[PDB]
């Protein structure tokens, strides 16, 4: 038995850390990480016996080997396999697949953010590598003229809203003091890509 996580979606430029868990029989065998939709036609990318891009760490005591793939590119999308190198065992017992979809655009940590009127909330907008140099914007849905846009230093600030772009992976939008009219749909956006975020402002408490 070899098992791993379910299919993944990751923004271009980010890394993944994949556990390949295996049964206690397989502690002593070489572990490998394979790419291809068809196990019998796959290409080995890294092995646990390599002499001393992708990193492998087999931990027999925890009965898992961990595969790290860094700086993923869109062309890295596809099927991958955890494998144990052992002869004379059913291939299904010593391999496990998963699909990695490397995406270009934006995503959001939490697409529903709520807070009491008069308090502050933060939205964390994530973006893939191709948007590092784009101005970032926060817009109210339905209102083109409402966008608040970062400057050349990745910054926007007025009385109500601050945007801080870390210039590599994410920009945060801080709504500094919610009013109940702020409830509704918004966009994190860069270039022609966007991700929807809902803000729910709840009543002030006694």
Author numbering: 1 to 52, 61 to 214
Task: Copy the relevant paper text.
To compare SC structures across evolution and to facilitate the design of chimeric proteins for characterizing SC-ligand interactions, we solved the 1.7Å crystal structure of teleost fish SC (tSC) (Rcryst = 18.5%; Rfree = 21.5%). Teleost fish express the oldest recognizable pIgR protein, which transports polymeric versions of IgM and IgT/IgZ (a teleost Ig specialized in mucosal immunity) to the mucosa. In addition, tSC contains just two extracellular domains, tD1 and tD2. tD1 and tD2 share homology with mammalian D1 and D5, respectively, but CDR loop residues implicated in mammalian SC interactions with pIg are not conserved. The structure of tSC revealed two tandem Ig-like domains related by ~90°. Like hSC domains D1 and D3-D5, tSC domains are IgSF folds that include the canonical B to F strand disulfide bond and a second disulfide bond linking the C and C’ strands. tD1 and tD2 share a similar topology, but only 72 of 97 Cα atoms could be aligned (rmsd = 0.87Å). Aligning fish and human SC domains resulted in rmsds of 0.77Å for tD1 and D1 (83 of 100 Cα atoms) and 1.08Å for tD2 and D5 (64 of 97 Cα atoms). The largest structural differences between tSC and hSC domains are in regions between the C’ and D strands, where tD1 residues at positions similar to the C” strand are disordered and the tD2 C” strand hydrogen bonds to the D strand on the A-B-E-D face rather than to the C’ strand on the A’-G-F-C face, similar to other IgSF proteins such as IREMs (immune receptors expressed on myeloid cells). In contrast to the human D1 CDR1 α-helical turn, both tSC CDR1 loops include a 310 helical turn and are structurally similar to human D5 CDR1. The interface between the two tSC domains is formed by residues in the tD1 A’-B and E-F loops and residues in tD2 CDR1 and DE loop, burying a total surface area of 591Å2. Ten of the 17 residues in the interface are well conserved among representative fish species, and five inter-domain hydrogen bonds may limit inter-domain flexibility.
